[PDB]
Design a protein around this nucleic acid. Structure first.
Length: 113
RNA sequence: GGUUCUCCCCGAAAGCUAUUUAGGUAGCGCCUCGUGAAUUCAUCUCCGGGGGUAGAGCACUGUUUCGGCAAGGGGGUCAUC
């Protein structure tokens, strides 16, 4: 299938296109392939009649899609409700990694203006 | 501006329209003289009408207050935005 989340890309290797499965990435790809006992030399283009099962099965074992994107974003407000550092820093846009906001932090403040 | 004898009858208008017209003039309206015509015309009563003014009203068009108060809120305090 195209499974959970619309589209699975094709005209490229199986592992690759599996990285484009909104919560599956570099490792996590070849880890499903290893599981499902199948190659990456073959593309997804070929979509095996075996691999077709394991698509939904192994992405069903991982927190992915809406499920993950829920939980994370539920927790950005969780701390926010409790007067946490991690909390308020999200509504100023600020980091939590001790980064340079004397100079940098132009992914947290947006770019130079 | 002035415009000269007499008697008798009826008797206006200062409105409208147009005008290089607005103190002019023309037509009409209104007067007069004559000739036709009509229970024509006029009034009044009775009978039938359409009316949007006066008055009144506040649905509508706007406008005004005052209670409540569906919604908005300016405004303050607080948070996470």
């Amino acid at each position: 299938a195209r499974i959970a989340g619309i589209n699975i890309p094709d005209h490229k290797h199986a592992v690759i296109a599996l990285t484009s499965i909104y919560g599956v990435g570099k490792t996590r790809s070849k880890a499903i392939l290893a599981a499902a006992g199948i190659a990456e030399d073959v593309k997804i283009s070929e979509l095996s009649e075996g691999q077709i099962d394991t698509l939904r099965d192994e992405v069903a074992k991982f927190v992915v899609e809406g499920d993950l994107r829920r939980e994370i974003s539920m927790s950005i407000k969780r701390l926010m409700d409790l007067g946490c550092y991690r909390g308020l820093r999200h509504r100023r846009g600020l980091p939590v990694r001790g980064q340079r906001t004397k100079t940098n932090a132009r992914t947290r403040k947006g770019p130079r203006k």
